[PDB]
Amino acid sequence: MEDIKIKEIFENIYEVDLGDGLKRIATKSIVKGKKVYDEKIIKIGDEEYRIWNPNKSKLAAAIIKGLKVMPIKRDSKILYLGASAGTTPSHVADIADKGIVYAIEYAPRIMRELLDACAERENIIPILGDANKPQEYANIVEKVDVIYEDVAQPNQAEILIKNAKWFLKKGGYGMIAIKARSIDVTKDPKEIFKEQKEILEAGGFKIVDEVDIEPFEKDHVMFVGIWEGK
Amino acid sequence: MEDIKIKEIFENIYEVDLGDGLKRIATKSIVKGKKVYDEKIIKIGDEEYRIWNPNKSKLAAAIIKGLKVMPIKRDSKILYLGASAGTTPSHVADIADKGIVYAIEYAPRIMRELLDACAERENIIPILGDANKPQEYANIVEKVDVIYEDVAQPNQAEILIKNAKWFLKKGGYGMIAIKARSIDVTKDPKEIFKEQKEILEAGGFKIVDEVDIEPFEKDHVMFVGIWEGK
Ligand code: MET
Ligand code: MET
């Protein structure tokens, strides 16, 4: 065997080095004994490190591909926008174990799967809603430190901006995974991302990180921006 | 012609988009009318933006290649370690126009060139010394926010650590450009960087950024770390 090293990176996220030259990361499970999506687990005593698969989570893909700005901390309040069976939300909940994760889902069937997958992760607050209409859940969602968005729609940038106006603290962060083809099927991906970046900046964000998440996702880029208001 | 856009990035650093698809950056000159190293200049009214050449400055190369953590701000106190004719120090001085740059040089001939190149940039404080002996200039160098090191020697990591112990504020940053071959001429560069990273972490740094600066420099990596003490 080779030496093994698990060290904390960012805050409450862990780099896993099995000595085989492959990059791996994990989160500390807040629900021991449960596998959310058949992820591999490294159990040390009572602590369980859930291997965070970049092939199944765009956030893990961004970290594996070089993300340097990771605003989600242990006491962070996060607004999660986007269809999910529970994969990324489960890991985000592990990270923000002293915080809250508001998960917005429109389809009851999607929420059904999310509730089953993230069962017992009590810091996740499910909210049936439409991200394009944040005013509807504004009496539920308190001001957040981070908005994480994974919505493959042409108006995804506009959605992040409106939700930021309603819920993001000044100085807070917006993380958005953008699928180029969900915006335009003709333009070159390079140009699409340039235009989307401009839209986010015009909306009030100062872009501080940008990660191409290939080969885990084709023509998808994770943008991270600090919210400065208007 | 194509549209031209100069926008601030990080703090007091500028992205220059001439509309030709090439990435360019610049700093706002604090000594108008003077070219330090025949750099190109964009003069707008009385303001002069000095194009920061990545082929001549490892710091510019790191930014061009994707650096996301840039701790040098307008009021930063910086300890600059490494031979220089004035290129990078001139730009760092432009950035930290409300701060101080302590430039340590051992050879009088090097200091001679630095003083001539950075003439009029009064926020640069030249100090003839040996970086391996920080105690000698400890009554001159006040606590700093950032240490920038460009020393191609096998003991460069040790030098950063000792200077950090003496001058770097807790929470401050260390930026070091490491030439793999100056450490070992046999080992694979990949392994050298891994070992150097470990040395820096053991020394008290939490690495928060790592930038391969090729093709501007072969087998050179810019590391950025937050100083947590011991
Ligand atoms: C389709 S559910 C798994 C992927 C989802 N985008 C997530 O990160 O949760
Ligand atoms: C040899 S002087 C120019 C390069 C130097 N390393 C600098 O950045 O100032």
XYZ file of C-alpha atoms and ligand atoms in Angstrom:
478
model
C 0.000 0.000 0.000
C 0.934 3.672 -0.210
C 0.549 6.388 2.411
C -2.958 7.868 2.649
C -3.699 11.477 3.504
C -7.002 13.216 4.142
C -6.575 16.924 4.793
C -9.058 19.753 5.119
C -9.242 22.234 2.260
C -11.347 25.411 2.155
C -13.619 24.946 5.160
C -15.013 21.557 6.136
C -14.164 20.006 2.747
C -11.515 17.311 2.446
C -8.841 16.356 -0.046
C -8.369 12.587 -0.258
C -4.970 11.326 -1.424
C -4.841 7.540 -1.713
C -1.338 7.688 -3.156
C -2.403 6.659 -6.655
C -2.031 10.062 -8.298
C -5.792 10.610 -8.608
C -7.506 13.711 -7.233
C -10.402 12.989 -4.868
C -12.409 15.070 -2.433
C -15.000 14.402 0.257
C -17.267 15.928 2.889
C -17.855 14.824 6.499
C -21.246 13.118 6.609
C -23.813 14.635 8.979
C -25.928 11.467 8.658
C -23.690 8.516 9.495
C -24.525 5.105 8.085
C -26.366 6.439 5.047
C -25.239 6.557 1.429
C -27.179 9.197 -0.501
C -26.215 8.021 -4.006
C -24.057 4.927 -3.438
C -20.994 7.142 -2.974
C -17.808 5.526 -1.646
C -17.185 6.078 2.053
C -14.036 6.253 4.176
C -15.046 5.497 7.736
C -12.508 6.501 10.375
C -13.843 5.620 13.794
C -17.269 7.254 13.898
C -16.504 9.882 11.241
C -17.581 9.090 7.691
C -16.039 10.847 4.708
C -18.292 10.698 1.672
C -16.351 10.686 -1.588
C -17.802 13.574 -3.627
C -18.047 12.378 -7.243
C -17.303 15.105 -9.847
C -19.113 13.002 -12.453
C -22.311 13.400 -10.430
C -21.901 16.862 -8.904
C -20.950 19.991 -10.824
C -19.674 21.579 -7.602
C -17.294 18.664 -6.996
C -16.241 18.930 -10.656
C -15.423 22.630 -10.197
C -13.286 21.894 -7.117
C -11.477 19.043 -8.890
C -10.887 21.314 -11.883
C -9.307 24.113 -9.864
C -11.911 26.235 -8.080
C -10.088 28.620 -5.714
C -13.022 30.654 -4.364
C -15.362 28.492 -2.256
C -17.685 30.736 -0.168
C -19.738 27.934 1.381
C -18.645 27.618 5.020
C -19.831 25.745 8.117
C -22.273 28.438 9.271
C -23.327 29.553 5.786
C -26.948 30.064 4.790
C -27.278 28.835 1.220
C -30.051 29.260 -1.346
C -29.884 26.250 -3.679
C -31.569 26.649 -7.081
C -31.885 23.793 -9.545
C -33.234 20.306 -10.172
C -31.548 17.733 -7.956
C -32.081 14.182 -6.762
C -30.057 15.160 -3.697
C -26.412 14.651 -4.739
C -24.925 18.139 -4.440
C -27.363 19.310 -1.750
C -26.297 16.382 0.478
C -22.647 17.469 0.263
C -23.421 21.158 0.693
C -25.386 20.249 3.836
C -22.368 18.288 5.135
C -20.191 21.370 4.631
C -22.634 23.877 6.144
C -23.311 21.649 9.161
C -23.831 24.744 11.304
C -25.833 26.532 8.621
C -28.925 26.182 6.436
C -29.629 25.093 2.873
C -32.853 26.305 1.265
C -33.639 24.019 -1.659
C -36.041 25.443 -4.261
C -37.773 22.890 -6.507
C -40.757 23.433 -8.826
C -41.840 19.871 -9.568
C -43.360 17.877 -6.686
C -41.767 14.740 -8.162
C -38.324 16.317 -7.955
C -38.928 17.401 -4.375
C -40.098 13.880 -3.609
C -36.732 12.451 -4.673
C -34.809 15.212 -2.911
C -36.664 14.640 0.367
C -35.992 10.902 0.193
C -32.309 11.361 -0.639
C -31.652 14.096 1.914
C -33.709 12.515 4.670
C -32.267 13.225 8.127
C -30.179 16.156 6.884
C -32.259 18.592 8.933
C -30.346 21.686 7.854
C -31.907 21.364 4.399
C -35.196 23.289 4.107
C -37.272 22.148 1.088
C -39.345 24.843 -0.592
C -41.692 24.050 -3.453
C -41.367 27.043 -5.736
C -40.383 28.818 -8.920
C -36.917 30.402 -8.867
C -38.152 32.948 -11.401
C -40.567 34.203 -8.714
C -38.472 34.697 -5.536
C -41.015 37.056 -3.977
C -43.175 33.983 -3.314
C -40.763 32.443 -0.808
C -39.299 35.660 0.616
C -41.117 35.189 3.945
C -39.335 31.838 4.338
C -35.814 32.405 3.037
C -33.767 34.595 5.346
C -30.866 36.595 3.917
C -28.253 34.151 2.607
C -24.461 34.147 2.354
C -24.409 32.151 -0.857
C -26.680 31.299 -3.760
C -25.781 28.146 -5.675
C -27.546 27.787 -9.028
C -27.687 24.851 -11.452
C -30.525 25.739 -13.838
C -30.094 24.881 -17.515
C -32.302 27.633 -18.927
C -31.701 30.676 -21.150
C -32.794 32.984 -18.310
C -30.561 31.420 -15.639
C -28.426 34.550 -15.246
C -31.528 36.698 -14.754
C -32.744 34.213 -12.146
C -29.515 34.460 -10.147
C -29.664 38.251 -10.231
C -33.280 38.477 -9.079
C -32.692 35.987 -6.280
C -29.560 37.903 -5.261
C -31.523 41.162 -5.077
C -34.058 39.470 -2.833
C -31.838 37.291 -0.660
C -28.089 37.740 -1.090
C -26.226 39.756 1.547
C -23.962 42.510 0.247
C -20.542 40.892 0.103
C -22.214 37.510 -0.305
C -21.526 35.135 -3.185
C -23.277 33.713 -6.184
C -22.145 30.392 -7.626
C -23.701 29.394 -10.949
C -23.024 26.431 -13.217
C -23.815 27.509 -16.766
C -24.484 25.075 -19.606
C -23.694 27.079 -22.764
C -26.105 25.139 -25.004
C -29.063 25.853 -22.706
C -28.631 29.527 -23.626
C -27.900 29.313 -27.353
C -27.547 26.342 -29.719
C -25.744 28.295 -32.455
C -23.144 30.663 -30.962
C -19.667 29.476 -30.006
C -19.598 28.435 -26.308
C -16.709 30.851 -25.760
C -18.882 33.768 -26.870
C -21.882 32.598 -24.843
C -19.848 32.501 -21.625
C -18.421 35.945 -22.357
C -21.926 37.361 -22.770
C -23.211 35.606 -19.656
C -20.296 36.944 -17.630
C -21.148 40.463 -18.821
C -24.797 39.971 -17.869
C -23.810 38.896 -14.350
C -21.442 41.859 -13.948
C -24.077 44.300 -15.221
C -26.447 42.707 -12.724
C -24.254 43.499 -9.736
C -21.668 40.710 -9.497
C -17.881 41.015 -9.582
C -16.682 37.708 -11.041
C -13.914 36.241 -8.860
C -13.638 32.690 -10.230
C -14.436 30.790 -13.422
C -13.944 27.050 -13.834
C -14.375 24.997 -17.010
C -15.678 21.687 -15.675
C -14.822 19.478 -18.640
C -14.453 16.561 -19.043
C -17.068 15.996 -16.335
C -19.471 18.271 -18.232
C -19.132 19.466 -21.827
C -19.309 23.230 -22.329
C -20.274 23.985 -18.725
C -18.552 26.689 -16.683
C -18.853 27.425 -12.964
C -18.846 31.159 -12.259
C -18.368 32.620 -8.790
C -19.106 36.244 -8.048
C -19.260 38.602 -5.105
C -22.563 40.448 -4.805
C -22.184 44.220 -4.587
C -25.851 45.057 -5.050
C -26.953 46.997 -8.120
C -11.459 49.116 -34.963
C -13.131 47.052 -32.254
C -14.508 48.177 -28.901
C -11.874 48.603 -26.175
C -12.468 47.903 -22.506
C -10.238 48.504 -19.504
C -11.809 47.290 -16.278
C -10.457 46.927 -12.768
C -9.798 43.410 -11.521
C -8.699 42.426 -8.005
C -7.754 45.784 -6.510
C -6.049 48.495 -8.543
C -5.075 46.071 -11.333
C -6.618 46.354 -14.785
C -7.760 43.970 -17.484
C -7.141 45.360 -20.970
C -9.369 44.068 -23.776
C -8.412 45.487 -27.168
C -10.980 43.298 -28.898
C -8.402 41.030 -30.527
C -8.945 38.001 -28.303
C -5.637 38.440 -26.458
C -5.446 38.660 -22.669
C -3.633 41.743 -21.362
C -3.343 43.404 -17.978
C -1.940 46.664 -16.637
C -1.357 48.808 -13.561
C -1.977 52.546 -13.075
C 1.409 54.264 -13.168
C 2.363 56.263 -10.069
C 5.160 57.945 -12.059
C 3.599 59.420 -15.190
C 5.753 59.954 -18.255
C 8.238 57.217 -17.399
C 8.633 53.778 -18.945
C 10.440 51.429 -16.563
C 11.263 48.709 -19.117
C 9.915 50.039 -22.427
C 6.464 48.668 -21.579
C 3.534 49.726 -23.774
C 1.389 52.492 -22.315
C -2.273 53.437 -22.696
C -2.589 57.083 -21.762
C -6.124 58.252 -21.020
C -6.065 61.916 -20.113
C -3.490 62.138 -17.330
C -3.786 58.488 -16.263
C -1.238 56.072 -17.700
C -1.873 52.337 -17.794
C 1.350 50.371 -18.047
C 0.919 47.092 -19.905
C 2.273 44.415 -17.538
C 4.213 41.914 -19.671
C 3.890 38.271 -18.493
C 7.047 37.438 -20.451
C 8.978 39.802 -18.179
C 7.141 39.452 -14.865
C 6.263 36.162 -13.196
C 3.467 37.888 -11.264
C 1.861 39.114 -14.496
C 2.302 35.591 -15.901
C 0.464 34.118 -12.898
C -2.450 36.548 -13.344
C -2.633 35.850 -17.089
C -2.551 32.116 -16.371
C -5.449 32.191 -13.920
C -4.385 33.426 -10.484
C -7.529 33.923 -8.370
C -5.981 34.908 -5.023
C -4.194 38.277 -5.255
C -3.529 39.647 -1.723
C -1.614 42.751 -2.802
C -3.931 45.736 -2.291
C -3.626 49.531 -2.399
C -2.602 49.928 1.254
C -0.582 46.708 1.463
C 2.881 46.540 2.993
C 4.887 44.114 0.881
C 8.239 42.425 1.482
C 9.770 41.735 -1.941
C 12.496 39.066 -2.069
C 14.466 38.316 -5.213
C 16.787 39.685 -7.880
C 15.076 42.313 -10.010
C 15.976 45.065 -12.447
C 12.733 46.740 -11.384
C 10.050 45.155 -13.600
C 7.735 43.470 -11.096
C 8.537 45.866 -8.238
C 7.459 48.820 -10.425
C 4.042 47.226 -11.000
C 3.625 46.134 -7.391
C 4.356 49.732 -6.351
C 1.673 50.963 -8.786
C -0.833 48.597 -7.168
C 0.098 49.386 -3.555
C 0.075 53.144 -4.194
C -1.091 53.723 -0.623
C 1.282 51.126 0.803
C 4.963 50.192 0.991
C 7.261 47.806 -0.852
C 10.437 46.699 0.919
C 12.860 45.417 -1.704
C 15.646 43.155 -0.405
C 18.706 42.813 -2.661
C 22.117 41.337 -1.794
C 24.267 42.573 -4.668
C 24.982 46.323 -4.820
C 24.947 46.063 -8.626
C 21.423 44.661 -8.560
C 20.277 47.396 -6.201
C 21.900 49.929 -8.504
C 19.703 48.808 -11.407
C 16.612 48.592 -9.210
C 17.108 52.128 -7.880
C 17.527 53.487 -11.406
C 14.483 51.636 -12.738
C 12.207 52.431 -9.801
C 13.341 56.023 -9.430
C 10.528 58.302 -8.238
C 8.430 55.394 -6.960
C 8.847 56.582 -3.372
C 6.798 53.786 -1.831
C 9.618 51.363 -2.644
C 12.154 51.080 0.202
C 15.465 49.530 -0.966
C 17.276 47.404 1.600
C 20.677 45.902 0.891
C 20.530 42.518 2.569
C 20.463 38.745 2.643
C 16.977 37.203 2.656
C 18.422 34.200 4.480
C 19.183 36.551 7.399
C 15.957 38.523 8.057
C 16.996 39.443 11.598
C 19.421 41.937 10.034
C 16.693 44.166 8.600
C 14.027 43.573 11.256
C 14.444 47.096 12.675
C 13.560 48.488 9.233
C 10.816 46.228 7.902
C 7.545 46.706 9.742
C 5.037 43.850 9.841
C 3.859 43.164 6.283
C 0.608 41.991 4.704
C 2.329 40.121 1.904
C 5.693 38.589 1.101
C 6.448 38.136 -2.593
C 9.417 35.869 -3.324
C 11.237 35.145 -6.591
C 14.460 33.420 -5.509
C 15.741 30.543 -7.637
C 17.552 28.656 -4.881
C 17.126 25.233 -3.249
C 16.392 26.908 0.105
C 13.764 29.335 -1.225
C 10.930 27.727 0.749
C 12.936 27.969 3.974
C 13.614 31.627 3.190
C 9.912 32.413 2.798
C 9.117 30.677 6.077
C 11.804 32.477 8.076
C 10.814 35.845 6.643
C 7.159 35.067 7.393
C 7.999 34.258 11.019
C 9.786 37.582 11.313
C 7.519 39.861 9.295
C 4.261 38.343 8.063
C 1.067 39.227 9.937
C -1.119 36.305 10.975
C -3.677 36.043 8.196
C -1.184 37.634 5.818
C -0.059 36.057 2.553
C 3.028 34.568 1.025
C 3.433 34.536 -2.747
C 6.368 32.529 -4.096
C 7.409 31.744 -7.658
C 9.231 28.418 -7.604
C 11.555 27.246 -10.373
C 11.591 23.440 -10.018
C 15.093 23.001 -11.478
C 16.625 25.397 -8.938
C 15.675 22.851 -6.265
C 16.549 19.568 -7.976
C 17.918 18.784 -11.449
C 16.905 15.106 -11.395
C 13.421 14.666 -9.891
C 10.272 15.139 -11.957
C 9.021 18.759 -11.645
C 5.641 17.413 -10.527
C 7.260 15.702 -7.543
C 9.412 18.723 -6.691
C 6.372 21.011 -6.502
C 4.528 18.477 -4.355
C 7.431 18.373 -1.901
C 7.787 22.155 -1.864
C 4.075 22.553 -1.189
C 4.406 20.169 1.767
C 7.383 22.128 3.096
C 5.399 25.377 2.958
C 2.398 23.793 4.700
C 4.611 22.273 7.405
C 6.127 25.727 7.803
C 2.814 27.379 8.614
C 1.139 28.181 5.286
C -2.253 27.014 4.030
C -1.904 26.944 0.239
C -4.837 28.773 -1.381
C -3.645 29.123 -4.989
C -1.204 27.441 -7.366
C -0.531 28.642 -10.902
C 1.617 26.950 -13.550
C 3.080 29.910 -15.430
C 4.048 28.144 -18.647
C 4.618 29.014 -21.426
C 6.008 32.250 -19.981
C 8.303 30.211 -17.718
C 9.114 26.508 -18.023
C 8.517 24.432 -14.895
C 7.762 27.426 -12.669
C 4.753 27.528 -10.349
C 3.371 30.461 -8.361
C 2.144 29.387 -4.929
C -0.012 31.584 -2.710
C -0.567 30.780 0.934
C -2.184 32.283 3.995
C 0.151 32.546 6.975
C -1.223 30.944 10.132
C 1.989 31.099 12.136
C 3.680 27.876 13.211
C -29.795 14.920 -11.210
S -29.456 14.939 -9.441
C -27.666 14.829 -9.449
C -27.095 16.031 -10.161
C -27.611 17.360 -9.615
N -27.269 18.465 -10.551
C -26.986 17.624 -8.254
O -25.859 18.155 -8.238
O -27.622 17.298 -7.233
C 15.516 40.343 -14.194
S 14.517 41.765 -13.722
C 12.965 41.355 -14.523
C 12.436 40.061 -13.954
C 12.342 40.063 -12.430
N 12.128 38.678 -11.929
C 11.187 40.953 -11.996
O 10.050 40.444 -11.979
O 11.431 42.136 -11.686
